[PDB]
Design a protein around this ligand. Structure first.
Ligand SMILES: NC(=O)c1ccc[n+]([C@@H]2O[C@H](COP(=O)([O-])OP(=O)(O)OC[C@H]3O[C@@H](n4cnc5c(N)ncnc54)[C@H](O)[C@@H]3O)[C@@H](O)[C@H]2O)c1
Ligand SMILES: NC(=O)c1ccc[n+]([C@@H]2O[C@H](COP(=O)([O-])OP(=O)(O)OC[C@H]3O[C@@H](n4cnc5c(N)ncnc54)[C@H](O)[C@@H]3O)[C@@H](O)[C@H]2O)c1
Ligand SMILES: NC(=O)c1ccc[n+]([C@@H]2O[C@H](COP(=O)([O-])OP(=O)(O)OC[C@H]3O[C@@H](n4cnc5c(N)ncnc54)[C@H](O)[C@@H]3O)[C@@H](O)[C@H]2O)c1
Ligand SMILES: NC(=O)c1ccc[n+]([C@@H]2O[C@H](COP(=O)([O-])OP(=O)(O)OC[C@H]3O[C@@H](n4cnc5c(N)ncnc54)[C@H](O)[C@@H]3O)[C@@H](O)[C@H]2O)c1
Lengths: 322, 322, 322, 322
């Protein structure tokens, strides 16, 4: 049998290199391979990482430039290839659908020649679009494809309430669901803080100004664009989300998490990827948990479904069926 | 200023040595000191640990036998001294009140000569009794005393439901509150699984036999006695709980957790220690969160209050007031 | 392919439970199985551990009582079964050869029915004896058997010099080789401190009393017996050594380490297990590095060879050949 | 006393953000503060990090934009401010002396108004130049200033030999000393691999082509420029070195490491910063270890001394004396 764990990261720019380096920090692989059209960048990133993994406190993690033959024995393949939205551009990841759908077809085209067994973690934007393209255009075990999705919005939700009330973000339970994008929404019906309603924190802390649900949901969406405008891009929080899914897979955790995959009738929605609660384990997504949404939350899920499906259509990605 | 973190563990037997070794594994201290009436055991435990901390992947953590002068510059002092209930004995930690109240007075008597600044983590049984004795018989900043309490029952709650439904225990939210003992209870009003009711898991997993709340609450209590009878003692889960509180303190996390401290009027209860939800940070317990208990849960909190207060009375520990 | 890592620990007493808990702390497995003749102890240890792995900072590591069918898909099997030398007894692990050789035959007898692919880490004493028995009495890939050996004496060497000079033990390079026992010796020819001779530390620190090589070598041997006499047993340092080998295997590190295996002509020695420098990787021991010993060091290796071979003979274990 | 650990990172670009994120991954602080002339970047980096530290496996590490008032209670201050050498430019960090000496004076000027107690880790290039400027132009406890120096070249040395022979880089002992720059050299006199000479690896591995010391020393220097040319910059290996020093300080390890500080007569050199072996602990640099260099190694140390002192002179930094 094989004691080694091999992870391939496609795209070795800001996101790929942050995912690769978090993997190295948390010692989640034996071997990390970087693939990029720009092989010089992939080589430089891998070389810089190979020096970090020579530290006395690091395991000897093998970093290198590679190619698609490295997908043959990959446990996990994280896809980060393709451009982002840039500072001052329209704050809408769905504008990337046309270009990035084509990159995802090209990249998944090469992967499936080498493997039908690697767990695929999608990060490339538009996240739900990219997750849809690789899930529907190729024969690949559906369980082995996961988009990070609204895991990152969910971290943002936790931090906003953590910062507002000076509470541990880990105490903030529940999910941001829907699109990794402007149709993300807080499923307030799923939420709590340390075993009590989030709306009760104002009473516990004697706040005169009451929490605005709309303010929290807009902040967690808008902060992604503020970071892109001020830092130039984002990579830290997404690298962390990537590692969280990697751990659910490698520790066969059976964790229920918000992540993106093609819906199969949940909330009356099919043939679109969005984030809904799904169990993640060594064999990838075992199933969804169709939590009971309020009428308003259900409306937001439908709006998200409509917005992603329209972006897929605009990029010339077909409807699919069984 | 001081870059070093010094933790003193009082009692170097099964529990103290497990707490000390978890601290070393998670690298939560610069220096770990063991204190025991049996200095030979404390020395042997510290020597065995000093070899582990010579591993290439360990920080150089200084383990040694020490004495109460090591409390002067201690960040944290974990109290594990005194006997447990033994296999085949009456499954009631409160039987330890008379003997262990006296040990706690002796041990806290020595600590307060050297420091008024160390975070004290109580583990010695009866946990609520021991936490009460050190909180009321000495002038010590009240914020700097925490009993692990029903944090351990809460891990047990998570594992039982994790094992029953094959879900991540981290998805199991809410608390076991009251006594670390036979008057522990599940505050079902505080609970969930991954943003939905625990009672809904039977539907998601199409189980014909429905979850019994009473069965879960009895199992999480009874399993402590089964482990004592079959292993001889417990130490792993409590060492883990100890480390969880240490991290809330050292990372100033502001985590809301079940832990034992003297109640100050919550649920109509005062002048007894029980576990209720409390925020833990660098300065110890900042405050409680008096979550709204059902009438049945409130009755169980009162029963727990009555049982611990009667054990304190039976051990000749006075009522105290402001 | 399989994202999961399964480790079986045979013997769930002081050593097995410490190895299992270090594995859980460092998150080195998906699943940890305990096997013991005393299934009650194995069950209790696994239950106590299952509560620790429900902590928010733990991966969902599955602990359970198991049986030899758990060896079928085991990545690693750590053998800790059988008695130790007890306080006040003759300080000679070789006295265990007769009893523990039989246990090792019984245990390895059951393993080889289920697997020819698990990495076997031997810990049971006499370590070199036990490592020899499982290596020679069964057809098993020789590369997949490693005794922890003088890795633990080497940690002891580092700590003694670390404590003497107030230097990081990680700066102490070189090996204790030979028997895990009274014929352990320091291969001074292999040693250094931070890139200079260990004998130069007295000059750097202006010490009037000069380091005694014999004093260091006797201390690192004698301290094992002092810990057994004062603590009752040892487990922490060996659990750490076990985890160090596990990491060399799971991270395919290619680390050169002192570990026990049957010699194949190194130093003129064959058909006995002792610790010599060996490279450890995902496929276990790839090879030895026959470092050039001084005449005195070579004499000590031969004395160790003679002492272990005589203990094997006394326990009725045959000579073997190719 | 204070349970919290606060680290300030000055410069929030590629290097500062990698140092900050490694600190967060290894949980080396309670609070990480970013300072930059570009406060938008510092804010964006801190916000992206604040989302990562909302993961269930992260401690609640507080990231924020800050200012020099955050230096008042800083345990550690890592200085990364100022430009690097850019792709296609002259491969000579010493060309940065004139500009970056002025930035270091400005930055250290502000720090010393708020603290005389923070451990200062210098990273800004020219590393030895920057380390010299902050050590000599201000009254600051000399023990509290360390440049990462040839720790990073030493990781590079380990990786080159690790990759060449398929051995663990942690087995590669000894140091690259002198300038973090073109006058870096391998102190071969200090080296080994797993307790034997590095030159013996060719024999162990039956290599026909013999190791070239000059080839290894040029590769470990040249690879920094290749990474800058191909990746655009470096940050991963330096972030790792930064964390290694942080751990020697916070775990009071007493580790002997190559790091940059003003020499006080070692090798006949004074009033210049270079990397020589130095012990690092909670109080910073306790002392140097003047290892006995060969005549050729001593010549290289003198060449390094001359090259850095000439760059300091060219940037208008004075000679200093006692
Ligand atoms: N899901 C999330 O939460 C999240 C967060 C951040 C970024 N992202 C997305 O991640 C992607 C990467 O972000 P970035 O900042 O690193 O982008 P970037 O534009 O800086 O880099 C993209 C990289 O992909 C490479 N690439 C392009 N086409 C390729 C192909 N066919 N094969 C291999 N490599 C190819 C490019 O050479 C480049 O190195 C973007 O789509 C971004 O929007 C997602
Ligand atoms: N709170 C929890 O969840 C939890 C869990 C497990 C055990 N415990 C409690 O932890 C305690 C320790 O358990 P154990 O199994 O290690 O017990 P043990 O009886 O094996 O060891 C107790 C140790 O305390 C030492 N000691 C006694 N009086 C002392 C004094 N005055 N000063 C210093 N040392 C002293 C003894 O010498 C002995 O080494 C017990 O009270 C047990 O019930 C609590
Ligand atoms: N190599 C080292 O550095 C090192 C260090 C410490 C201990 N040890 C050795 O480890 C072994 C265990 O030490 P301990 O303190 O845990 O011993 P122990 O006597 O406390 O426990 C041994 C356990 O093995 C079990 N066992 C016995 N025969 C068995 C069988 N056939 N199958 C399964 N389980 C069986 C027993 O029931 C018991 O639980 C001893 O031989 C000891 O000397 C080695
Ligand atoms: N020692 C090493 O091994 C090593 C390795 C890599 C880089 N470096 C050095 O680290 C430095 C940073 O590298 P980089 O790639 O991040 O550079 P960069 O040019 O991308 O960023 C430098 C940052 O410093 C900020 N800055 C400039 N002057 C400042 C001031 N007075 N106060 C506060 N912030 C200020 C800038 O706004 C910018 O954000 C360079 O000098 C580089 O050569 C050292």
């Amino acid at each position: 049998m094989n004691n080694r764990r091999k992870i391939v990261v496609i795209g070795a720019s800001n996101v790929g290199s942050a995912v690769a380096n978090k993997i190295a920090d948390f010692q989640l692989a034996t071997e990390v391979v970087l693939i990029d059209l720009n092989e010089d960048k992939a080589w430089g990133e891998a070389k810089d990482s190979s020096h970090a993994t020579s530290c006395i406190y690091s395991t000897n993690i093998k970093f290198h430039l590679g190619d698609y033959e490295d997908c043959k024995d990959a446990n996990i393949i994280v896809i980060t290839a393709g451009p982002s939205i840039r500072p001052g551009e329209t704050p809408d990841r769905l504008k990337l659908a046309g270009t990035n759908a084509k990159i995802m077809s090209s990249v998944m085209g090469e992967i499936v020649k080498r493997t039908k067994e690697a767990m695929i973690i999608m990060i490339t934007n538009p996240l739900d679009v990219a997750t849809y393209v690789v899930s529907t255009q190729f024969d690949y075990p559906r369980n082995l494809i996961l988009g990070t999705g609204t895991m990152l919005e969910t971290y943002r939700f936790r931090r906003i309430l953590a910062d507002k009330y000076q509470v541990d973000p880990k105490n903030i339970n529940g999910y941001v669901l829907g699109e990794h994008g402007n149709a993300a929404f807080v499923a307030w019906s799923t939420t709590g803080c340390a075993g009590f309603p989030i709306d009760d924190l104002d009473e516990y802390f004697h706040r005169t100004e009451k929490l605005s649900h709309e303010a929290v949901e807009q902040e967690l969406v808008q902060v992604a664009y503020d970071v892109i405008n001020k830092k130039g891009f984002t990579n830290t929080g997404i690298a962390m989300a990537a590692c969280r899914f990697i751990k659910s897979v490698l520790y066969d955790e059976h964790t229920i998490l918000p992540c993106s995959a093609v819906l199969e009738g949940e909330y009356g929605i099919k043939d679109v990827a969005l984030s809904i609660p799904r169990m993640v384990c060594a064999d990838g997504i075992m199933r969804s948990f169709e939590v009971h949404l309020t009428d308003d939350e259900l409306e937001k899920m439908h709006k998200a479904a409509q917005s992603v499906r329209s972006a897929l259509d605009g990029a010339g990605i077909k409807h699919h069926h069984h």
